[PDB]
Design a protein around this ligand. Sequence first.
Ligand SMILES: CCCCCCCC/C=C\CCCCCCCC(=O)OC[C@H](O)CO
Ligand SMILES: CCCCCCCCCCCCCCC
Ligand SMILES: CCCCCCCCCCCCCCC
Ligand SMILES: CCCCCCCCCCCCCCC
Ligand SMILES: [Cl-]
Ligand SMILES: [Cl-]
Ligand code: NA
Ligand code: NA
Ligand code: NA
Ligand code: NA
Length: 297
Amino acid sequence: MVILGVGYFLLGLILLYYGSDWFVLGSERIARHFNVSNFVIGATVMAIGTSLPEILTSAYASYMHAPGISIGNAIGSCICNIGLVLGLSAIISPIIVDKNLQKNILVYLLFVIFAAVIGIDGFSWIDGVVLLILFIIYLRWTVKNGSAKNNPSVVFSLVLLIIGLIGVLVGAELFVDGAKKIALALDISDKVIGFTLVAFGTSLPELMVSLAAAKRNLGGMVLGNVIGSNIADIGGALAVGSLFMHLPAENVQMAVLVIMSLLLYLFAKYSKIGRWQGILFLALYIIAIASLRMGGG
Ligand SMILES: CCCCCCCC/C=C\CCCCCCCC(=O)OC[C@H](O)CO
Ligand SMILES: CCCCCCCCCCCCCCC
Ligand SMILES: CCCCCCCCCCCCCCC
Ligand SMILES: CCCCCCCCCCCCCCC
Ligand SMILES: [Cl-]
Ligand SMILES: [Cl-]
Ligand code: NA
Ligand code: NA
Ligand code: NA
Ligand code: NA
C-alpha cells in the first residue's frame, strides 16, 4: 500500500521526465513539418494536450455538484502557469518576444479580462458557451497568423509527440495517485490540502513540458504552452464546467490572474521575459499560495 504508492510516485516522475522531452521534440518537428512556429504548436496542440487534465477535472467536479472545485482548478491552473511554470522557464531561458507574438498575448489579455468581467456574478452555462466559442476563434486566428505518401520523418515525429503526451498524462496520474496512496498509508491524508493541490496536479504536464522546452531554449514554445493553456483552461475547462452547473465567482483569483496577465503582456511588449521577470512571477506565485484561501474552492 505504501510501497506501491512509492512505486507509482517514482514511475510517474520517470514518465513525466522523459515523456515531456519526447513531447517537446515531436512537437518541434511537427511545427517544422507544417511550417508553423513553435509558439503556434505550443498554443494549440501542446496546450490543449496538457490541459486535458483540467478539462476532465472541471467537467467531472461540476457534474458531481462541486462547482467550487471546478473553477478553483481552472483558475488556479492559470495562476500556476504564469507564476510557477513561466516563472521557472523564463529564468532558465530568457525570451524576447517578437512583434507578431505580442499581438497574440494582447488578445490573450483581452480574453482574460473579458472572462473576469462576466464572471463577477459567477459563470453560467451561457458564459461557458461564449468562452468556448472565443476559444475556438482564438485557435483558428492563431494558426492562420502562424502558418506558411507519408514520410518516415513525419511518422517518427507523430510517434514522439503522441507517446510523449501519453507519458506526461499517465505520468502525472501515477504521481498524484502515488502521492495519495502514500498519504493514506501514513494516515496524513487531508482533503482540504488535497483539493488545494488539485490545480497543481493537473498542471504537472505544463510544468515538465515547459521546463523541457526551456532547457532546449525553445522560448516561443514555452510562451505558447503557457498562453494557450490558460485560454484552454478558461475557454475549455471552466467553460465545460459551467455547462453542468453555475460556477461561483472567484473575483480575488481572477483579479490575481488579470494582474499577472497584464504583467506578462507589459514585459512581452516593452521588455523581455527573462531572469528578473521570472523572479517576480515566482515571488507573486509564492505570495499567492501563501495568502489565498485553501480548499481549492
Ligand atoms: C473576436 C474574438 C477574438 C478572440 C477573443 C478576443 C477577446 C474577446 C472578448 C470579448 C469580445 C467578443 C464578445 C462576443 C464573443 C463571440 C460571440 C458569442 O459568444 O456569441 C454568443 C452570445 O454572445 C451569447 O449571448
Ligand atoms: C482551421 C485551423 C485551426 C483548426 C482548429 C481546430 C480546433 C479544435 C479545438 C477543439 C477544442 C475542444 C475543447 C473542448 C473543451
Ligand atoms: C480583476 C477584476 C475581477 C472582478 C472585480 C469586480 C468588482 C469587485 C467585486 C467584489 C470583489 C471582491 C474581491 C476584489 C479583489
Ligand atoms: C540560471 C539561474 C540564474 C539565477 C536564478 C535565480 C532565481 C531566483 C528565484 C527566486 C524566486 C523567488 C524567491 C522569493 C523568496
Ligand atoms: Cl464545491
Ligand atoms: Cl522557440
Ligand atoms: Na495545457
Ligand atoms: Na456571469
Ligand atoms: Na492545472
Ligand atoms: Na494541465
